[PDB]
Amino acid sequence: MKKIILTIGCPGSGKSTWAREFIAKNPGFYNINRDDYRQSIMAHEERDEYKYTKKKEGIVTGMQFDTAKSILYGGDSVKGVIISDTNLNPERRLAWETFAKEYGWKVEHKVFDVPWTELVKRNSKRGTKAVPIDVLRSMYKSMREYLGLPVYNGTPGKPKAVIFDVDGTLAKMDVINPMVVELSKMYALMGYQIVVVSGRESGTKEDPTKYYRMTRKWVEDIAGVPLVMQCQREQGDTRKDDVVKEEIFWKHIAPHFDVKLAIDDRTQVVEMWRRIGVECWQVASGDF
Amino acid sequence: MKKIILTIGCPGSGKSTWAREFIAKNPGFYNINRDDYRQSIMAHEERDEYKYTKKKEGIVTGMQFDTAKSILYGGDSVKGVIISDTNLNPERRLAWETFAKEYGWKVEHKVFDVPWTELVKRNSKRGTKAVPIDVLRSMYKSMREYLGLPVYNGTPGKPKAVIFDVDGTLAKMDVINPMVVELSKMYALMGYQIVVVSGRESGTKEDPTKYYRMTRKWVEDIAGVPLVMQCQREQGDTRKDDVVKEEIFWKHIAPHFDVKLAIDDRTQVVEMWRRIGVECWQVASGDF
Amino acid sequence: MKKIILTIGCPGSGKSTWAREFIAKNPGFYNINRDDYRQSIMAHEERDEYKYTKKKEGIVTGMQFDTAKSILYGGDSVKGVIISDTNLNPERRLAWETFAKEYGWKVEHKVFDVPWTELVKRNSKRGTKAVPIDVLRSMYKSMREYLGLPVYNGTPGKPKAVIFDVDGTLAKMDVINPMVVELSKMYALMGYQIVVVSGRESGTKEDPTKYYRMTRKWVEDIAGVPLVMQCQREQGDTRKDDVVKEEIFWKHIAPHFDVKLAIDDRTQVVEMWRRIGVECWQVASGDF
Amino acid sequence: MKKIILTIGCPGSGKSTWAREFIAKNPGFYNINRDDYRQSIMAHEERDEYKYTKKKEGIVTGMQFDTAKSILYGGDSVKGVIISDTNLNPERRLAWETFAKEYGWKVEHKVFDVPWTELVKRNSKRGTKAVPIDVLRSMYKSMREYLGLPVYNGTPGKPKAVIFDVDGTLAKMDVINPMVVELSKMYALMGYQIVVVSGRESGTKEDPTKYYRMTRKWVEDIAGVPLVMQCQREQGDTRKDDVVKEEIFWKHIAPHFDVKLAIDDRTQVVEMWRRIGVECWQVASGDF
Ligand SMILES: Nc1ncnc2c1ncn2[C@@H]1O[C@H](COP(=O)(O)OP(=O)(O)O)[C@@H](O)[C@H]1O
Ligand SMILES: Nc1ncnc2c1ncn2[C@@H]1O[C@H](COP(=O)(O)OP(=O)(O)O)[C@@H](O)[C@H]1O
Ligand SMILES: Nc1ncnc2c1ncn2[C@@H]1O[C@H](COP(=O)(O)OP(=O)(O)O)[C@@H](O)[C@H]1O
Ligand SMILES: Nc1ncnc2c1ncn2[C@@H]1O[C@H](COP(=O)(O)OP(=O)(O)O)[C@@H](O)[C@H]1O
Ligand SMILES: [Ca+2]
Ligand SMILES: [Ca+2]
Ligand SMILES: [Ca+2]
Ligand SMILES: [Ca+2]
Ligand SMILES: [Ca+2]
Ligand SMILES: [Ca+2]
Ligand SMILES: [Ca+2]
Ligand SMILES: [Ca+2]
C-alpha cells in the first residue's frame, strides 16, 4: 500500500532536512509542502513577508490535495509522498487519514520532538523563515498535546500554594529583592503555603548539600520566608532547569499542594510553567 | 580637517546600509567595521557563530586603530572614515576622540535612534547576524543613556503605589483574572496606592470617553479594585502603547506617587517599564 | 474572460521579478512556476543540483495543469494566473492555448526580450540558479525564433566569400597574426571573395574616417589581404559590436555575397555569427 | 619561528574552506584576506560589484601588512597567520618573503591545484563571488607557471603541421563538416603535415581498436583527409579529454612535428591547446 508520511513538528524541528535526505535515499518518494506553495503562488522572493488569507490557504490546501492524488496515482515506481508541514492541527491530520482511506493509501507519522529551548534558538537565527514567538509557543503547545504530555489542573482538597524561585527572584546577587520577598510574606498572611524551588545544584560530589544548606539558611536568616518546603536540583544533575523544575513539580509538589501561582525570573522556566498549566509571573528580565 | 564618523546605533539600526550609501555618494570615504574584522580573522562563513575572546577583540581593535591611521594619512583625496560599529560604549567613544586629537582629526557622530519595538522586529529576522535578545536590551539601554532619556528613581515624600494594567492583566477577555485582581486588593491592605492604566482608547470621535467609562465601571463593579487613579490613552491617539504609557507615567503619575512596581502583560510595555526604572512583573504571555 | 499569462523569456530575463510586482499591484492574480515545483517535490535546498527526469517532469507538468484549473475555477475574485516559465518551446505554448480554449479562458504573452550579452552577464552571477551556457544559447535561439528574427541560409548565384575581422583576428596589437593572415590569402587562391569587417569606429567627430583609412592601409600594406570589401562601424555609433556587425552583414554583405564562413575572435560576435546561420571559427580567446 | 601561510590557488579552489578548518583545528592561527578588506572598506553588501582602483588596492595591501605584523607580534599564544588570497602573482609572493625575513618569520605555501574544468564549474555557480572567465583563465595560467607545467614553443627542424580533431570538427554526427574538411586539404597543399586526433576511445575491452579502425576508415574513405598520423584515446582510459589529448601531444606529436595550429570544437580541449602554447581555432559551439 502506497504511504503518505505526515511530518509532525514545530517550525525549525528538522522536518525538511529529513525529507530531503529520505527522498535522496529512497527512490519513489516526493515532497509536498505548503510553505513552498505559499511562496510560489505569490512569486515571493526569499525575504518577502507572506500575507495570510483564507483564499490563499484554500488554494494551497487544494494544491496539496491534487498533488497527492496525482503522484500517488502514478506508476508502480511511486512509493509514497511526504507532507512536510507542521501537521500540528488535529483536524488537519484527520483529513489526511479520511482522504487516505478512500483512495486506498495508508498514513504514517514521523515525529520531530525538539525541546522548546532549542526551537527558540533555531527560530531566532532562522532569519526570513523565522516565525513569530507566539505562534511558536502555540505550535509547541499543540506538539505537547500530540505527545500526550501532562497539563496541571489543580489538586482538590490539598492546601493552596505559591511557588517561589531563589536566584533572580527572591535573591539578586546575595541581597534580597525587596518586593518579591515582601510578596511571599504577603501571600503567607493570605493563607497560602509557600513552596520554594531553585535550580541551584544541591552541592558538590564530596559535599552533596553544600549549596542546598546555604540556600535554606539564606531563605531563613535573610529573607525570612515562611516556607513549608524547599526543593533543589540534585547534585550531579546536569539537565536543563527546564526539565529539572518540572520533574520536581510533578514528583514533589503537585501531589501535595493546590498550586495557584509560580514566581520566577528565567524565561525558559517561566515558559515551562505557563505551558504546564501553572499561572506564572515573571518578576525580571531573564533571557539567559 | 579629515573627519572620523562614529555611527551610534543598536544592531539592526541602519548603520551599514547608510555607510554604504554615504560612501557611494561621497568619494574619499571608507568604512571600518569590527563585525567584518571579526569574521575575517576566523575565515568564518556567513552562518558560523563567532566565539568571543579578549585576544580576538584586542586584535580587531588593533586592526581598527591601524586601519584608521593608514587611511587618514593618505593623500588629499582622503576625506575621512566611517566607524560603523554600535559605538554604544562611552569609554570606546572617548578613545576615538583622544585618538583623533593627537593626529589632528575631528570626530562626528551619526545617530540611528530606532524604537525598541522595531529593533526587536528586525533582529528576529536578521537570521545569522541576529544578536541575543538580552545583549539587544543592553545595547538599547546604552543608546537611551547616550540620548539622555529619563530613568525613574522614585518620588520622595509621595505615597508608594503599584501600577496595574487592565487588558490581559486585571481583565482577561470581560472576566476577572482571579490572582491579579486578588493582588491589587492585597497591596491595598498593605498600604499601597493602586494606580490603574490602560492602553485602551478612551472612546470614539463622537463619544470620546465611551471606553474609559466602560473600563472605570468594570474595574469598580466587577473587579472591585480600590484604585485612586485611572489613566487611559486619549481618544484619537494612534501611537504605540509603548510611547503612550510612558507619556502618561511622567505626566500623570511619577509626580504624584512613589511607584515601586508595575503589573502588566504586554512584553513591549513590560520592557518599557524595566527600561525606565520601574520594577515590573509580567503576569502572562504577551508577545503581541 | 479570465486570462492565463505566459511569460516568454530566457532564464535571467526578468520574468519572476515582474510576476511578483504584477501580483503585488493586481489583486486576483497568482503565479505558477515549474522551477518552484521542481525544487519542492525533491525538498531541495537552494544549493542542490536538480536531476532531470521524465517522471519528475510529468509530475510538475501535472501540477501546473491542476493548479491552473483549480485557481481559475475560483470565485469572481480570481482574475487570472501567470505561468512564469521560459515558455520558449512552441509545442508547450500551443498546449496552454488548447487547454485554455476548452475551459473558456484566454491566453496572453508578456515578452521579456533581453540581449544575449546581458543574459550571459546575469546567468554568470546567478549562482545556484545559473543555467549551463549551452542551454542558455539554446533558449535564446528559441527566443529569436519566437520574435521571428532572421537566420541566413545563403545567397544563390552570388560569389562565395569568407568574412575576416581585424582586431584580434588579422591584427594582434599592430603586428600581423601569421596563421590568420596566411589563411585569407589561402582562401583567395581557392576562389573565395575576402570580405573584411571591423568594429573599430571609422573616425572622430572632426575626422570621421581616420581609423577606417588607417585600417584599410594596414590591411593593404602590412597584411597584404586581397580583399574586395571592407566595412566598419560608422563614426558616432556607440552600440554593441554585437548589433553593429549584424546590421552591417544584412545591409552590405548578405545581398552581395554567398558567405560560407566568418573568422573572428570576440565571443559575443562569434556567438552572433553562429546564431544567425553563419559558420564561424574563433581564432583566439576573446572573452571581453 | 612563527609562520605565514600563503594559500596558492585560483578563485574557487578551496582556499577559504581550508583556512576556516585549519583555524578551527589549530589554536593560534588567524586569517587575512583581501576580498574581505575590499568589501569592508566599501561597506558593500554580498551582491555589490566592487570597482577596482589603485587607491583601494594600496589600502587593502596596507591593511594586510599592518594586520600581519600586529598579530605575529602577539604573545606566545600566536602561532601564525594564513594569507588566503590567490597569491598567484610571483612579485606578490616575493614581497611576503622579504617582509617575513626582516621580522624573523618563515613562509610556507599550501597549494590548491584544481583542474581548469572544475574551476570553471564552481565559478559559474559562485554567483556574486563569481569572477570573469578571462581573469580565471589568467589566474590558472599563473597557477601553471607556479607548478612549472610545460608550455610548447615549437619544434625546430621538424616539419610544420596542423592538428585536426574528428568529432564535431571534421565529422558532424557521420557526415562531413564541409569547410573544415576542405581546410585540411587546403593546408596539405600548402605543405603542412596533417595530424589527426580524437578523444574517442579506441575500442571495447574485447575489441580494443573497434572505434579507432572505424575512425581511420571514415577519415580515409569519406573525408579524404591526407593525414600522416592518427592518435586516439586508448581503450580503457576514462580520464578527461583535457588530460588525454595533452598526454598524446607531448608523447606522440610535439617530438615529431612543428605544430603551428590545432583545429577543435570542444571548449575544454580548445582551452587546453591555447593554454599550452598552441594556436587553436574553435570551429563550432562546444560547451559540453
Ligand atoms: N540538528 C540541527 N541543529 C541545529 N539546527 C538544525 C538542525 N537540523 C536542522 N537545523 C536547522 O533548523 C532550521 C529548520 O529546518 P527544517 O528541517 O527545514 O524545518 P522546517 O520544515 O520547519 O523548515 C533550518 O535552518 C535548519 O538548517
Ligand atoms: N528602513 C528599514 N526597514 C526595515 N529594515 C531595515 C531598514 N533599514 C535597514 N534594515 C535592515 O536592518 C538590518 C540591520 O542593517 P544595518 O544597517 O546594516 O545595521 P548593522 O550595522 O547593525 O548591520 C539589515 O537586515 C537591513 O537590511
Ligand atoms: N534590470 C535588471 N538588471 C540586472 N539584473 C536583473 C534585472 N532584473 C532582474 N535581474 C536579475 O536577473 C535574475 C533573473 O531574474 P528573474 O526575473 O527572476 O527571472 P527567472 O524567471 O529566470 O528567475 C535575478 O537574479 C534578478 O535579480
Ligand atoms: N570539494 C569541493 N567541491 C565543490 N565545491 C567546493 C569544494 N570545496 C569548496 N567548494 C566551493 O568552491 C567555492 C570557492 O571556495 P573557497 O574555498 O572559499 O575559495 P576562495 O578563496 O576562492 O573563495 C565555494 O563556493 C565553495 O563552497
Ligand atoms: Ca521541553
Ligand atoms: Ca531564577
Ligand atoms: Ca522606544
Ligand atoms: Ca495589557
Ligand atoms: Ca542580441
Ligand atoms: Ca575582433
Ligand atoms: Ca587541467
Ligand atoms: Ca571534438
Side-chain angles (χ1 to χ4, degrees), chain A residues 31-45 48 50 52-75 77-95:
Chain A
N31 177 232
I32 297 168
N33 177 277
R34 287 151 97 175
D35 278 344
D36 289 339
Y37 297 165
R38 230 118 50 170
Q39 291 308 193
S40 192
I41 63 180
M42 293 292 88
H44 272 154
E45 284 169 13
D48 300 313
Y50 170 88
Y52 183 80
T53 255
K54 63 149 294 292
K55 188 61 188 171
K56 303 222 250 298
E57 281 308 300
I59 298 305
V60 168
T61 292
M63 294 176 74
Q64 287 201 304
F65 179 84
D66 299 341
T67 300
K69 300 173 74 296
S70 303
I71 299 190
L72 289 177
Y73 270 125
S77 170
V78 182
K79 303 309 177 184
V81 305
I82 300 169
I83 304 303
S84 53
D85 293 341
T86 55
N87 288 310
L88 287 177
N89 183 313
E91 176 65 73
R92 182 64 184 172
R93 246 137 45 213
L94 185 47

Side-chain angles (χ1 to χ4, degrees), chain A residues 6 89-101 107:
Chain A
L6 306 187
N89 183 313
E91 176 65 73
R92 182 64 184 172
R93 246 137 45 213
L94 185 47
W96 277 103
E97 242 140 46
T98 49
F99 158 97
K101 102 84 185 66
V107 179

Side-chain angles (χ1 to χ4, degrees), chain B residues 115-116 140 242 275:
Chain B
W116 172 246
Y140 185 62
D242 201 306
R275 173 205 306 165

Side-chain angles (χ1 to χ4, degrees), chain C residues 18-45 48 50 52-75 77-285:
Chain C
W18 173 79
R20 189 181 67 134
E21 177 264 335
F22 194 84
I23 289 164
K25 299 296 186 189
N26 298 89
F29 277 99
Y30 307 79
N31 177 232
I32 297 168
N33 177 277
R34 287 151 97 175
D35 278 344
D36 289 339
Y37 297 165
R38 230 118 50 170
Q39 291 308 193
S40 192
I41 63 180
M42 293 292 88
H44 272 154
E45 284 169 13
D48 300 313
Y50 170 88
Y52 183 80
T53 255
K54 63 149 294 292
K55 188 61 188 171
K56 303 222 250 298
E57 281 308 300
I59 298 305
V60 168
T61 292
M63 294 176 74
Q64 287 201 304
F65 179 84
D66 299 341
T67 300
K69 300 173 74 296
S70 303
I71 299 190
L72 289 177
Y73 270 125
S77 170
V78 182
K79 303 309 177 184
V81 305
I82 300 169
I83 304 303
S84 53
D85 293 341
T86 55
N87 288 310
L88 287 177
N89 183 313
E91 176 65 73
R92 182 64 184 172
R93 246 137 45 213
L94 185 47
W96 277 103
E97 242 140 46
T98 49
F99 158 97
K101 102 84 185 66
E102 59 176 57
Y103 298 95
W105 301 309
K106 59 172 168 172
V107 179
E108 292 183 54
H109 289 184
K110 173 66 182 189
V111 188
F112 295 80
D113 179 19
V114 169
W116 172 246
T117 179
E118 260 307 301
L119 288 172
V120 174
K121 170 71 164 306
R122 306 181 181 185
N123 188 238
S124 70
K125 291 187 286 196
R126 255 293 206 59
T128 207
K129 298 194 307 169
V131 115
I133 191 67
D134 57 281
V135 311
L136 186 71
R137 177 170 300 116
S138 180
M139 290 278 68
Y140 185 62
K141 171 183 187 294
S142 289
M143 173 66 101
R144 286 172 40 68
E145 271 153 16
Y146 173 86
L147 300 166
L149 290 172
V151 177
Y152 178 65
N153 192 29
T155 309
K158 248 64 207 304
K160 299 182 172 179
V162 183
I163 298 188
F164 284 76
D165 166 81
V166 186
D167 284 292
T169 308
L170 286 160
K172 252 277 55 58
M173 202 151 90
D174 294 45
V175 68
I176 79 296
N177 192 13
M179 296 306 283
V180 176
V181 176
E182 178 183 66
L183 186 59
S184 66
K185 294 166 186 178
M186 275 173 69
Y187 272 114
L189 299 185
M190 292 284 86
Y192 291 93
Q193 311 280 281
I194 288 62
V195 180
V196 167
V197 178
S198 171
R200 288 176 183 171
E201 190 166 0
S202 288
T204 60
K205 41 233 64 69
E206 39 277 322
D207 186 2
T209 56
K210 185 187 301 300
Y211 303 130
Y212 179 84
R213 295 197 310 283
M214 287 178 71
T215 300
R216 176 214 284 142
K217 176 183 182 168
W218 185 90
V219 181
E220 291 173 347
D221 297 0
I222 297 249
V225 179
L227 65 181
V228 149
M229 182 177 81
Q230 173 179 165
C231 296
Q232 277 183 61
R233 163 195 293 269
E234 271 143 42
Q235 173 284 314
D237 198 325
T238 64
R239 296 174 300 170
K240 287 275 185 167
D241 258 6
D242 201 306
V243 175
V244 185
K245 284 189 179 183
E246 203 194 326
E247 181 187 72
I248 286 175
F249 173 85
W250 298 112
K251 303 188 181 186
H252 296 149
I253 309 180
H256 300 293
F257 305 90
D258 193 21
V259 330
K260 326 301 264 56
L261 218 217
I263 311 305
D264 218 296
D265 79 303
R266 194 179 193 183
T267 307
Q268 77 158 55
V269 174
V270 174
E271 211 71 70
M272 175 279 287
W273 283 140
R274 289 165 184 160
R275 173 205 306 165
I276 64 177
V278 181
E279 197 176 334
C280 174
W281 297 345
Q282 196 174 184
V283 300
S285 295

